Amino acid sequence: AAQTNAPWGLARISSTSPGTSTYYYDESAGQGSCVYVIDTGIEASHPEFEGRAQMVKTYYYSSRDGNGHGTHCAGTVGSRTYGVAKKTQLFGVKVLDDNGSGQYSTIIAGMDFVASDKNNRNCPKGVVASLSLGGGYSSSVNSAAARLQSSGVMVAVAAGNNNADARNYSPASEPSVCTVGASDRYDRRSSFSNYGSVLDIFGPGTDILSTWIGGSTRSISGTSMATPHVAGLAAYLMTLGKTTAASACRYIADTANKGDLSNIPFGTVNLLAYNNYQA
Numbered sequence: 001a002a003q004t005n006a007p008w009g010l011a012r013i014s015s016t017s018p019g020t021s022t023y024y025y026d027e028s029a030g031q032g033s034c035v036y037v038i039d040t041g042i043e044a045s046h047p048e049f050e051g052r053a054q055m056v057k058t059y060y061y062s063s064r065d066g067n068g069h070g071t072h073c074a075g076t077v078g079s080r081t082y083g084v085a086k087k088t089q090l091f092g093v094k095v096l097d098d099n100g101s102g103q104y105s106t107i108i109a110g111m112d113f114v115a116s117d118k119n120n121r122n123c124p125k126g127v128v129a130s131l132s133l134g135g136g137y138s139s140s141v142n143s144a145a146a147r148l149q150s151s152g153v154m155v156a157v158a159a160g161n162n163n164a165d166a167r168n169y170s171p172a173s174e175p176s177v178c179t180v181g182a183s184d185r186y187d188r189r190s191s192f193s194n195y196g197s198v199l200d201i202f203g204p205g206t207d208i209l210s211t212w213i214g215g216s217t218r219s220i221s222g223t224s225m226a227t228p229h230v231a232g233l234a235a236y237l238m239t240l241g242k243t244t245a246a247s248a249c250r251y252i253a254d255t256a257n258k259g260d261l262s263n264i265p266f267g268t269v270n271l272l273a274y275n276n277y278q279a
Helices: 008-013 069-078 104-120 139-150 223-239 248-254
Strands: 033-039 053-058 089-094 126-131 153-158 178-183 201-204 208-212 216-220
Touching (some): 008 201, 033 104, 069 208
Antiparallel strands (some): 208 216
16 A cells, blocks of 8 residues: 655655655554553544544543643554554553653553553454653663563553663663664654664654644654654554564564664664565
């Protein structure tokens, strides 16, 4: 399948070169997979989600996304226009308040929630969790991400936006999950992207158009935007049967575009997420 005039990041993940604008992908499109977006919530009523999104948990007075961040990330995973895996099921877990903040204890509870809640959902092709969040190093936060991964969920986490080594941030620094840095449309490391040996992969993160609250759209930047590209890619590849939740991060690294990014510090992987779809 071909989506013309796609957001640059979608076109990038199906291309061996920057500078194109059509997204190519297998029409299975993540059908039968599920992606949890652990964030500020999801405006599930947005036409872009087509009834495939729902809130399943909140720790606050509402499950609605009063911020936009979670809706944007969910849109990059799975919206009809802005999403990588256009037929996946999206489940929102609101661990962040409407200012975008959350206590680590709540975030940990949300991760353990997903590890159990997947057993209440129909995801025959597999389960992914997208975590566009983080703070300073915490062994307890890393352990929660490790448990979620161990339980059979492909965990993708943002590297962070400090232009610093991600070893000092959580859950970015957890070795067993997929830690995602950000790139721009010219294949440069995004100016804010964290780096370091703990990164597994880069995805599009600068000037990413996606869904927003109030039934709208906007372009924003962050490792928060790169992470759902990778989460959606994992769901798509799992639906194709090419990989599993336990092996998808490694598979994405195996099949990535290699050596094509600029300003990658010595010792950080030079790997850009790529669907290897041959139309």
